[PDB]
Design a protein around this nucleic acid. Structure first.
Lengths: 98, 277, 50
RNA sequence: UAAUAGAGGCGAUACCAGGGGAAGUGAACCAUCUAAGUACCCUGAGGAAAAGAAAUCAAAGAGAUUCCCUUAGUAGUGGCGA
RNA sequence: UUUCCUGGGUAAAGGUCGUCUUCCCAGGGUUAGUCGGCCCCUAAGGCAAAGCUGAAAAGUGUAGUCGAUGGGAAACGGGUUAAUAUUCCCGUACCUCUUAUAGUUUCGAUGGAGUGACGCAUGAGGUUAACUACUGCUAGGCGAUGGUUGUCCUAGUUUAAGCAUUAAGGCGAUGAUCUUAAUAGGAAAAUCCGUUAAGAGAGCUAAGAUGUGAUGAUGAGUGCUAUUUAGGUAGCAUGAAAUGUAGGUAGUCAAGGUGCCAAGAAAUAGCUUCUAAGGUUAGGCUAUAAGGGACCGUACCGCAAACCGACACAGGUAGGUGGGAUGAAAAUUCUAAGGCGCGCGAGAGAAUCCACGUUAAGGAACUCUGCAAAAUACGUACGUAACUUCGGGAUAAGUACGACCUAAGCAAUUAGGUAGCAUAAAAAUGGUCCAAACGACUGUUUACCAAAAACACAGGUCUCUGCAAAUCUGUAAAGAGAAGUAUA
């Protein structure tokens, strides 16, 4: 898996924004098959900077209840689960694309 | 040996007696290299059914590797190191330390003491504790731990306080009176240990209460007349019957006098005169 | 009152899981029958509980 | 061990061959008998399977096996009861 | 399994209402080398090549492999968000390895050995968070009503892992580590053989205490700003006020010490150690700086409207914390922190239903039956029978004292004085005696009308069983009996 199938997209959220502003942390949606090592390698190849460390989470799928055309519960649908990455850079390092 | 009695400070202690362990090198833990932890049995078999009833959860105990087959150590003297309590059998166990450094357990005879030297083989002296083939033991001695097939080990008498009486020798066979009282022929090449087995007060004990019987791993016994006829041939006790039937086991086999030994067994040749009632 | 369904998880998966079904003849018949009927859930292992 | 070749499992709550094989019932009880070699289980295959080129039928002179029509509810069989 | 947080909504669901909700809609939220797993180990147990037995399916079963509720490298304190933290940040540590350097010197198994490694009861003692008793130090108050700038009132006075120092106690001088000489195990060994000759050898374990960690953090408070229900609450700044004495619990020392019989896991892991096939920078070891932490779980409820009971159900649900006063106590009552006021109410009080309080005179006259209630109840003293297996019966029965102040006294109690109808003043806290039947007794039993005289029981007798034992489960093999042996 090339370093392009690893990193999916960043996250722009209030929590991630404050974290990035304060302690220089970047949060990404990554592929579920990645791990710490190739996430770090992918960050290096993509943005030409080596991260101090990486943390990964598995976000479970959010369940929804599906109702008929009239509308009344007939089953349980679900969103897609995904993997979230916190990436820690050195205090001088930055990522510009954001 | 001896019996220690109790003052009746509770209604259960009135008839509790236990052994006194004075003839035992006390304060003892078993040799770590000869004992392994084990389950408690409770009488269930590989299929998981109960094959023997009324056996349950007693005190947890380790297993001590005994040696009833001293044959591969002929001519090598050994030292008695200690006399120890064994929870897996009535008799006590002696720890022999051999001259080559190997240590082993044996059934402790009656009257041996720490520091004694024990020897096994045809050349051994006739002394309590020595193991010799029946050839060499003179008529008129008392032996124990008799081997039944060469190389098998001691499969005959082994329990506390027992001994067997050598009566006669002839051809390939020696006549031996066993503790049940029958006279049986033994092949002359099997080994035996000289002298009685110590700890002869083991069965003079009065257990005292149902709890100790539970400690010994013995679940309660339910009579047959307390049953229903579906449960036991004797059931039907609408006001204390006596079975209404000749006594039988729970499976219909007669029990007052019925002889259950096979009528054409292979060993019938070697039994001179059976035991007495 | 303690009652009929004390819900363990190791017991659930060990006793009624897919591998326990495949492990013997009757379990494989169970699986074939449920496949034929077209059940949406074949075993208790479709409830992801370890 | 090596070398290849072929098998493993599923489908078809159908069909086929082989092995094991009931009982509710009927006989106005019931045990022989019936239901029935049915239900079910197990092992094997196939596009069909099985069977098949007479050490056969049977009193006619026919000429392998298999499937329909008739013989015929006849010949027999059955606590000669069902 | 999103029920968690924020914003929005009231078809329905909420036993009423609803702007509200655990309900609905959208978005956000779970960050680990140290936590729990994964992993290396085994117990109960499952599976199982071979072997054996069976019409078939399969059944037994050894070598092997899985299987925690157990054994195994490593972290604590504080802060921060609307929600996550032993995970992030701050401060300070620890454990494993990969490479490289420098001093090196014997490394290397799926094999051997040691350790791992354990019971119950029971004191007494060493230390100690929490907790109150006092002194002081700090912050606030000096009080709508008599007295209160004092011996006043209220509150705080906090702070870990790790590291260094030493060491209460215990085990130890009958030997714990070691040094040779011999060697009948199973790979063969410089280890274990701990077996045996000497003879040199006393150290090991260990809570805790001090310092550092820590001029840090925390911090009752105080100060600006807005806001206000005129009470505090939102942020921002700032703030050693004892690391004081004495008492002292539950932990811990302690897998301790001392007794007892019912004689008290396993490991191939971890730790240490020995070598074969082999290796002699091929490594292993001691450091030292450089960097590598796998994969999964992490939100929220978790004595409950989020689990189990069809329910927003008077039920059930393991373990650790368990403040203060009273007291022997985790009893009883009250109360701090904290959390709640049971998800229909408001009027009226008729009969009656259920649950309670009190009562003239009599005290079981009620009734199948003293059923139910009432009564007895604590502590310290006095005094206790028939009968008995000599232990008991026995808390037998019966009775006295108990408050407050002062004095004596170590305390328990003693004396005097004072007050009340009542002084174990509340609550909690045995009714007793006589005789008979049955069962000896402690226990067990009809989950959901029978708890008993039934079952069990220690004890007794008869009888079977010589070990490829009797017995039991199966067509068998096979397993239990039993790794037992007629004192079974």
């Amino acid at each position: 898996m090339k370093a392009y199938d690893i990193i999916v997209s960043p996250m722009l959220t209030e929590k991630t924004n404050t974290q990035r502003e304060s302690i220089n942390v970047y949060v990404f949606k990554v592929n579920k098959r990645a791990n710490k090592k190739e996430v770090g390698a992918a960050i290096k190849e993509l943005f030409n900077v080596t991260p101090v460390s990486c943390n990964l989470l598995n976000i479970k799928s959010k369940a929804k209840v599906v109702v008929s055309r009239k509308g009344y519960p007939i089953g349980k649908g679900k969103t897609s689960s995904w993997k979230k990455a916190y990436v820690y850079l050195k205090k001088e390092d930055k990522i510009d694309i954001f | 040996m001896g019996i220690k009695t109790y003052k009746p400070k509770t209604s259960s202690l009135r008839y509790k007696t236990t052994l006194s362990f004075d003839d035992l090198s006390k304060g003892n833990d078993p040799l770590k290299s000869l004992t392994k932890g084990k389950k408690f049995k409770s009488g269930r078999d590989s299929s998981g059914r109960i094959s023997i009833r009324r056996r349950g959860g007693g005190h947890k105990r380790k297993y001590r590797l005994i040696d009833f087959n001293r044959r591969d150590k002929f001519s090598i003297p050994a030292r008695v190191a200690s006399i120890e309590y064994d929870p897996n059998r009535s008799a006590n166990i002696a720890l022999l330390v051999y001259k080559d450094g190997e240590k082993r357990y044996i059934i402790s005879p009656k009257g041996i003491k720490v520091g004694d030297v024990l020897e096994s083989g045809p050349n051994a002296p006739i002394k309590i504790g020595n193991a010799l083939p029946l050839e060499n033991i003179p008529i008129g001695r008392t032996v124990h731990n008799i081997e039944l097939n060469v190389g098998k080990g001691g499969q005959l008498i082994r329990s506390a306080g027992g001994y067997a009486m050598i009566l006669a020798s002839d051809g390939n066979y020696v006549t031996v009176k066993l503790s049940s009282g029958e006279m049986r022929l033994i092949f002359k090449k099997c080994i035996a240990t000289i002298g009685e087995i110590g700890n002869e007060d083991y069965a003079n004990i009065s257990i005292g209460k149902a709890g100790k019987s539970r400690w010994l791993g013995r679940r309660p016994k339910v009579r047959g007349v307390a049953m229903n006829p579906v449960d036991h041939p004797h059931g039907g006790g609408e006001g204390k019957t006596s079975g209404g039937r000749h006594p039988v086991s729970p499976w219909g086999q007669p029990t007052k006098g019925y002889k259950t030994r096979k009528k054409k067994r292979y060993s019938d040749k070697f039994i001179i005169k059976r035991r007495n009632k | 009152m303690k009652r009929t369904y004390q819900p363990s998880r190791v017991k659930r998966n060990r006793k009624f899981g897919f591998r326990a079904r495949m492990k013997t003849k009757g379990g494989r018949l169970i699986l074939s029958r449920r496949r034929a009927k077209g059940r949406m859930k074949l075993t208790v292992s479709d409830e992801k509980k370890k």
